[PDB]
């Protein structure tokens, strides 16, 4: 179906321990494909997925130079935001930025993104129109005025409607055997006694891609959302993800409970129950 490309920038100052570190990672959907780290012995944009390795030297030199320039620009930005908040030179602060594009099954732009945070709180974001800004506070208004004066939103729009979708479509074709393959979850239900009164039913989903999934427990066909313990979806390390959902059930009432699994890799949604 639809697909996304995202870059994630983290710039971290560390007074007394050198200049701020700049890290950039790129994703297509839930697959990381590049990384940059200014702390590396020799900083370079580096491949993290096999299908990006076929890009030629011009690609790697160009993205490396952009990342090296960003290392300097984000150091400037950290100095600026420290001033906008009247903060001392002694503390460590973080700028985070996420930007990129979503495309539909036909490759057309669905929406573009550019959002920033300072010390973990929203700072400034490009609106969905790709032409105006939302600033969180009076400090971010300074950045907004600077970016309005520079017509930076127009530069974001040009990138998001152009290069972003063009290269995302290229990546999707070059990595089509993985990026356009959905792997269904392997599922099972476990039973963990608690006492003579109750036991835990746990519904497992393993080895699925992409990370998007729905795992729910029902009792007599009614969703048990408030009573279900739902662990955060977690990476297996082999590109796939894992998740489980658990509910505490009265002894002997186990058959009133069903686990429902929805995932893009599945021919049809699954309904599972405990099988003693």
């Amino acid at each position: 179906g639809s697909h996304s490309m995202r870059y994630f920038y983290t710039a971290m100052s560390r007074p007394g321990r050198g200049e701020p570190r700049f890290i950039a990672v790129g994703y297509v959907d839930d697959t990381q494909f590049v990384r940059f780290d200014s702390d590396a012995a020799s900083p370079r944009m580096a491949p993290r997925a096999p299908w990006i390795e076929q890009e030629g030297p011009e690609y790697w030199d160009r993205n490396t130079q952009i990342s090296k320039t960003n290392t300097q620009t984000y150091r400037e930005s950290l100095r600026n935001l420290r001033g906008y908040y009247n903060q001392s030179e002694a503390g460590s602060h973080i700028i985070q930025r996420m930007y990129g594009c979503d495309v539909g099954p036909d490759g057309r732009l669905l929406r573009g993104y550019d959002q920033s945070a300072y010390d973990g709180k929203d700072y400034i974001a490009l609106n969905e129109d790709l032409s105006s800004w939302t600033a969180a506070d009076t400090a971010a208004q300074i950045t907004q005025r600077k970016w309005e004066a520079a017509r930076e939103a127009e530069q974001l729009r040009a990138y998001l409607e152009g290069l972003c979708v063009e290269w995302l479509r290229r990546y999707l074709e070059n990595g089509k055997e993985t990026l356009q393959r959905a792997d269904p979850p392997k599922t099972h239900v476990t039973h963990h006694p608690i006492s003579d009164h109750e036991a835990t039913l746990r519904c497992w989903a393993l080895g699925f891609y992409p990370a998007e999934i729905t795992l729910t427990w029902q009792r007599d066909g009614e969703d048990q959302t408030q009573d279900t313990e739902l662990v955060e979806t977690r990476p297996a390390g082999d590109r796939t993800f894992q998740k489980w959902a658990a509910v505490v059930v009265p002894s002997g009432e186990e058959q009133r409970y069903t686990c429902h699994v929805q995932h893009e890799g599945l021919p049809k949604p699954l309904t599972l129950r405990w099988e003693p």
């Binding site: 870059y7 950039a24 790129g26 944009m45 690609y59 160009r62 993205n63 952009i66 990342s67 320039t69 960003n70 620009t73 984000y74 400037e76 930005s77 600026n80 935001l81 700028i95 930007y99 920033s116 400034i124 950045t143 600077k146 970016w147 520079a150 930076e152 530069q155 974001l156 990138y159 290069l163 972003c164 063009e166 290269w167």
Partner: peptide, 9 residues
């Protein structure tokens, strides 16, 4: 592909 020529904050 990264966006080039970012303006500082």
């Amino acid at each position: 592909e990264l966006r080039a020529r970012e303006e500082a904050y």
